[PDB]
Amino acid sequence: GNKLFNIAQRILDTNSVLLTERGDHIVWINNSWKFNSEEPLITKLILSIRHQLPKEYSSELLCPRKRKTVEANIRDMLVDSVETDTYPDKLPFKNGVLDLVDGMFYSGDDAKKYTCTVSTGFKFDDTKFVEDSPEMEELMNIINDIQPLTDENKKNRELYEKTLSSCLCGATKGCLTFFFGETATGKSTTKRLLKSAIGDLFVETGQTILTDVLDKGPNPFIANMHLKRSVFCSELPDFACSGSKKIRSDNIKKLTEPCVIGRPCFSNKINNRNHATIIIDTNYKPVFDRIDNALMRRIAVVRFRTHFSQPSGREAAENNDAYDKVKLLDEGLDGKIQNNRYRFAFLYLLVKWYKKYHIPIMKLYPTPEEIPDFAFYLK
Amino acid sequence: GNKLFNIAQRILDTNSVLLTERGDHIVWINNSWKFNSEEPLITKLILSIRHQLPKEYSSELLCPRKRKTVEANIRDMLVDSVETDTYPDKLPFKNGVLDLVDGMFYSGDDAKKYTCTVSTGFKFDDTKFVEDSPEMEELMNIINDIQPLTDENKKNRELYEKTLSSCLCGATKGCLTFFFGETATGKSTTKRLLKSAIGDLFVETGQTILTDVLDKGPNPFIANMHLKRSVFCSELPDFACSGSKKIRSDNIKKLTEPCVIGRPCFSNKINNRNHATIIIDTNYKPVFDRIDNALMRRIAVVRFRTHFSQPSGREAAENNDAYDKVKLLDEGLDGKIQNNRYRFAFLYLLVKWYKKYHIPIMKLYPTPEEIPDFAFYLK
Amino acid sequence: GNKLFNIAQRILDTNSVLLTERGDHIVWINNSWKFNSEEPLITKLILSIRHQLPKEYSSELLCPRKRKTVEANIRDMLVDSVETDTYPDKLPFKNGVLDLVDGMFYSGDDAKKYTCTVSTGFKFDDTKFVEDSPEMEELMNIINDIQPLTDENKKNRELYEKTLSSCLCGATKGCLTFFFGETATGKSTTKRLLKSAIGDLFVETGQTILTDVLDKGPNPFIANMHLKRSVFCSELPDFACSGSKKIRSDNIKKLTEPCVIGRPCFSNKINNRNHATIIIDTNYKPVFDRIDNALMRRIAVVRFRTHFSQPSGREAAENNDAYDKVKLLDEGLDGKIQNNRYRFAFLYLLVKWYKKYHIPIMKLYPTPEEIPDFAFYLK
Amino acid sequence: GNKLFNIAQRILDTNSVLLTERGDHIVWINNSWKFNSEEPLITKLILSIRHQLPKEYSSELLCPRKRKTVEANIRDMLVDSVETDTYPDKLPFKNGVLDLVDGMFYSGDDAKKYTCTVSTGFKFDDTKFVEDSPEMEELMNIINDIQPLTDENKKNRELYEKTLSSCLCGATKGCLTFFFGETATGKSTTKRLLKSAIGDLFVETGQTILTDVLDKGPNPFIANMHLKRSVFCSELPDFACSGSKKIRSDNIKKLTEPCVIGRPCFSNKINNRNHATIIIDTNYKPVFDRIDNALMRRIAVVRFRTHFSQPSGREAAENNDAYDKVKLLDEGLDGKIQNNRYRFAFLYLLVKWYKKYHIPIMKLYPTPEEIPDFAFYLK
DNA sequence: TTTTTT
């Protein structure tokens, strides 16, 4: 019958268009699933895939109204919804998905059955994903400077590696990590390194998600954690002064389930999938309002005890108590981190740690033996 | 006359399009009633049903403009409205509806008179609906290790079975159930098992539906309860501190009526049908602003008294009063629960329980003798 | 000359389309005046009336574009508006209009001169409108159980009958009736019986109209009171505690006028005709911010003093003060009420009460000898 | 084959239209990367570029329908997102981008590869960018008057020059500078000079961003800092009064990060780029809530020691202990400053200073030894 | 303030 109907049937046969649960129409272009709500991408996919059709059918696919007719025919054939993000050991990129169980990097048709929606936003460069490189040497030097691998800092180093590496798998975690340390110790440098490593799967929200009710009214901070694999809560304010609200234990206990409750502005969606590895950048000891067994089993803390300073404050840092080693500060480090110099090296280090630690199963274990408030309860 | 008008008349003769009370246009495709408020589905139904018409009539159902013309013709014939979800003991799936009185599964045109708008979303596979299976044995062991069938725990076990089986019927209930218990006991595991069992007929709202006014302004947390067969209000906070809002008895009174008043954003419809078995996952025993007879007969409480722990703190938990039986924590249990492995077995168990308990008639009976606050008013 | 203009003139000459003061376009199809905002029914009317036209004109009336053109022609002829709903003693049904002065039921064009906009939503069947029937006996027994016809309960019985029967007349009532009583007495049963009786002339709204202003912003809770003949506001909160807002006498005084000010979303029509009988289901004596004689002549109270109980707690209820009679609860009553078993019987009883009471003139009256707050001002 | 498709290809491959990460389209007309979300400038670009095509292609760019078709065809070719504002050493004007490495100024296609979004708002005129001019001499006299270049005031002079010159590059600053001085000293003079120099890349808001939280509710002051290169904080109230708000340290720590978290009204985007130099205009010694080493490395203070007054209080100014030199006040300065008589002269001075100081890298240093509150902790 | 708008 109609020629454009055959075009729609052929586009549907290759299985490039899917109907999601939320009602969006995800397409498959440039080896990455993409979607949008205000402007659907069906016509973009049609024009892109034009080339893979027979000769007499390609020339028919240039007039915009014919493309619109093909899209209208396509939209009348998608009746069944398909769920997304069911594989929790994959790291999708802009040109494929990097498998984590064995380090292979699929692309094209091979990297298609893993229906991943979110993506890092940048392509994968296999040349720089090699272990031996000067960038790897510099990165290893920096990592060892931040967390020295001595015997007194063994369990701390293992916890640091495990927590940092947990930011790759897209599963649900069950513990919160506190980056405790003094001033100018390396927390923000680690944050920026991780952000450059994973890219789009990393958001930074405010402290409001910890001490305020997250049910009444809109709360876009909760709504922006949808399908993210890492969330940072930086600069926790001190509580030694008055007027500062305590950390609600209910909020912590509500941030470790596969579905958190919260809605964005002007919308009615109230369910958010929770794949986030929540890390809190603090400067002082945290204080809570209620303490019980249900809270002490969901808290972990790693300590940074290496101070980077200038020659001016060398004697001040040497005689301090919160530091165990003093090192020379560097100026170009903060400069060339944003330029994505240690990106692929850190990615390789993270995947190596992931395959070393979480290969059978991924899980985080609380360490409540470090907080004095919980040390009192260790009765 | 116009051949398109004949097409519309033939489509209407098959009784596939219906005009519901709220003003939607439900269709009948893939053995399930579907509807969407944003985009109509009449064109999809026309395209899908083009096959059941003579050969000369099929060729006109290909051009989208003709399909829109037929949709416009159909929309000007539905004058009289009908109501949906009149039978409360039928479970609608994505490819049929399963009867609950005798376990018979209907499909096709036979499963059409029961106008069930809602659906679980996943198809029915009778090959996995049998009693003999290793999955059934594992699920039975898990259930018996969560709520043991000893003599001391007989009434609690039967109340647990009754409450869980009540999540299948499609009529109004009259009791709120609290899943009271200590930490690491088996509450969230039961919640996730039920979610895997009943699929999409299971929503999770915040605690604002309990300690806040649900009338003024928008409130999608109430508007999403429309025709839901189960509702969870998880993770209740403690009320022994300051500024802790008590549970308003007015909300509890309202949540047990056939109509719950509340509207979503950008809409005018304010009435919502209530089919939900409200279950609250709490950790401390609740306290209300006032206690009276009208609140005495609308609350039931079950107890979970089996702690799961790792060999680390085994003796620390064995020396506690809050537990009656200590077992070993299993890691992969949640991993294979999220994969929907114990879905159909638990569905079969739920059907068996419902047929054992509520087959003559369905009702829930309160247990007010569990709350010390309620105990004082009868002391 | 033109042809579609002749068809439009013929349609208008039959006097089937009218323009209201609010600016709507009411349509006379299937023996009922219908109207809707989202979907204009003029095309539906054209398609329905196609049958009573000359044959050479009927075939022209099948293309949707031609129907749209005829609708556009019709919309440009209605220059003068016509008032609606001026007869206050008519009950409009889905298949005609039932009189309330002599019990006769008109149909067809005879029941067209009464411009009735709203409708009950269900058809009228004279087969079940008889006096002798087992359902009538059951309903009479239930009514006598809820309100015994004793000498001490004589005035309350007649006030209850008058208040229930006042929900049929489409005029303005200047009194608010309170359903004051203790738990498990039968207020909800009466509400459900009334709802099954009248049908769509019954709206339930939240308590936000009694404790919050009804002017600021959109307020569909008040905007849905337009031409509704009954309004119920159950689950009245207690006020003995702190933080409970008292009932504003301003709202009560404003709700007793033939025009309440309130607007729905997406509209500018802020005038609402009040034909409702406001009834409140309460369990405590209501309180207000201030008490005055102007609030005295608008409030009436009936008392429910028949506790229904299961055999488990028969003795405890028998030893109570706030009850005068204890009976056995029936589980199937609420189940079979939802099936509209006692619909036409209660309709006939209400018609009989209306013919007995309000035939000369209809007016509600206050009983200020019930509320202790008002008894203070009578001291 | 097709003819408009080749036109769209020619428009695309010349790299004139680009897609941003937020979903908007930026075009290139009038030598500026302007964009509008409501008015698409694609048609304007097509009609402007029609001159650079063969004579047989121009005739098809006259019908508005054909230009709309070309726009629609172009919109279906932008698949990959492009990030903007990556070069931190380019100052964008309205008619081109001025480089800072060598002082050369580009325009047209040259100043196009640098995807600059924001702009100063005024055109660049090379004829007024000379080194010798009466405006240069008057401006140099003013600058030497406000900050005398004595050996007692050498470090302060160069620190002032560095802080002023830092307001050109688009990197991320890491220090806050206090323009602490007495009244009528010349702080507003420098503010107005800078505002005339850089124009649109300069905003001034209230002091609330220093004594308030930055997470609760909306914060339009944060959304105003997006891609701004200089922020001036004036009208700082005295703190030695009663109940005066204290400068919150947490705001200072959160205001020096590459991304500040905060959402504007009615919006959901919570991330913001921090390219702005923060200069605070106080009058007295600032007091904070808490002093710690984390606040020691984010504070810089310059001193103004030249008072201006009329001969009225000449002896009072000459005898005051807080000044170092007093001169005669001028009235026409604020007249010709608002007429931008010292616009390009100050710009050239700023460019010279930037080339002198921050040509290898950009970095601002703190100076903790200028406030006694910070001299207390020398122990 | 948001929602409502628009």
Ligand SMILES: Nc1ncnc2c1ncn2[C@@H]1O[C@H](COP(=O)(O)OP(=O)(O)OP(=O)(O)O)[C@@H](O)[C@H]1O
């Ligand atoms: N391995 C390293 N080698 C050289 N310099 C380093 C190294 N790690 C960090 N630095 C530098 O030392 C400083 C450490 O800053 P850091 O990231 O600890 O700050 P922060 O966590 O934001 O501080 P605070 O807790 O005071 O707010 C930075 O100037 C950084 O460039």
Ligand SMILES: Nc1ncnc2c1ncn2[C@@H]1O[C@H](COP(=O)(O)OP(=O)(O)OP(=O)(O)O)[C@@H](O)[C@H]1O
């Ligand atoms: N029968 C079983 N055998 C072994 N492990 C089990 C069994 N049932 C549950 N578990 C595991 O024991 C743990 C119990 O955790 P659960 O989700 O029940 O906690 P919870 O009731 O939500 O806790 P809290 O009150 O602290 O929030 C889970 O890891 C679950 O997988």
Ligand SMILES: Nc1ncnc2c1ncn2[C@@H]1O[C@H](COP(=O)(O)OP(=O)(O)OP(=O)(O)O)[C@@H](O)[C@H]1O
């Ligand atoms: N005549 C009757 N005989 C037997 N049972 C009856 C009779 N009338 C009502 N009932 C039953 O008694 C119960 C009355 O409960 P109902 O919901 O009417 O109480 P209520 O007064 O609204 O309660 P509350 O104010 O506490 O919410 C229902 O189960 C109803 O079916």
Ligand SMILES: Nc1ncnc2c1ncn2[C@@H]1O[C@H](COP(=O)(O)OP(=O)(O)O)[C@@H](O)[C@H]1O
């Ligand atoms: N170098 C100068 N030469 C002439 N007049 C000056 C000079 N510096 C400041 N003034 C005059 O002093 C007046 C007030 O100075 P102002 O910039 O307001 O000081 P502050 O910023 O401390 O309030 C201005 O109107 C300006 O004309």
Ligand SMILES: [Mg+2]
């Ligand atoms: Mg840092």
Ligand SMILES: [Mg+2]
């Ligand atoms: Mg739990």
Ligand SMILES: [Mg+2]
């Ligand atoms: Mg009630």
